[PDB]
Amino acid sequence: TKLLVSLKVLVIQLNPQIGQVDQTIKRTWSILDKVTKSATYVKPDIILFPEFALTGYSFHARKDILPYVTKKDEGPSFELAKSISEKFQCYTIIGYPEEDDEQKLYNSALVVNPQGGQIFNYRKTFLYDTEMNWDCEENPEGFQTFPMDFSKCAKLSNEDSYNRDVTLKASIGICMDLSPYKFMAPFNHFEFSSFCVDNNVELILCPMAWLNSTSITDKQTLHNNSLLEAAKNKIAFALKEQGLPLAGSQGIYQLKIGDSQRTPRVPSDDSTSEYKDMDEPDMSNVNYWILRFFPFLYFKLRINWFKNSSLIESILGKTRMPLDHEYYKDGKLLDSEEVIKDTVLEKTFLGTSLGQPWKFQGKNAILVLANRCGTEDGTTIFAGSSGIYKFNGKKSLDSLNESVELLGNLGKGLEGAILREVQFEVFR
Q: Could you say which of 90, 136, 175, 373 is catalytic?
């Protein structure tokens, strides 16, 4: 049974600085107000915020993030998402620093239903270097899926109106989650994107604090004072040329609400990575983000892989999580006498299953990326470029691949919001 779904997705792109929570929240309401006043405005069904959307990201010590940590059902970020969900009758997902009853710190993203109550709270599974500064904990449950009850969004292919309800299988990934584990794991693993293919995720939500390539990540540079001081000046000039403060743009909102302007398919070159053109998206990262969702992309060589059975040992050998992850402190292949369960036949490697060359073929999935913009510590330039994508499964490792639809993107250095009417199909 096919089921056409029309989802109205809104993405908020912010430039939060540490210590400006009230100011950021105030700017957020300013953005949302401007959105509703758009000529082509329509009420969103789901609103996504970036990673640590209100508090800032670059925390250097545990004591520095402590004044901004909250419980999953308490604090500014929760009340914000709650008020938004009650004012727009929508789902609201926002990234926030979390503290539980056991006084453990997480990099989390809470979800609030239209009734103004949280239904889920995802924690960051793969941690970035900055998380180590305040001793962030890995998600003990690893990658997770959760249902989202959408009303008046679904319809049969014969019907002329989306009057039916649909429970979409959603999944949240945060920044590093897309990257290989600790930047050490093989590139071909594609942990998060494979997880979504394995568990048949229909809606993918990604709050991000993703970086622009011009940022300083060299470890020997950061810990060499004369090298670091010389490195900071290179970034300061790039922001000064663009007529912006060192922290980046704030208060000036780029709005793409209701339009259907798609993002041009562009291959990655030496110019697409430069930090210029604030209203334009970082196509170097856009292409990279798409590449990290390889199992959703069409790849011609999958036929040769399936008939020669090259990935069978990889599929059967594939574990749920990396063996040294927090996931394997609680939970726990043959070729024996045990039968093959359905979950095994759902497992994939490089988008290939045991029964299909390309498992996702014929399916639809929606990718929503909320990435922050701006600059922190005078070393870290966030890529912004928030956007919405669609994997059609119809039969190039970048945006040139037409198995993914670029439904729109925001600027790489401007606060703002993008709304898109997303249409796709599921199966019930």
A: 175
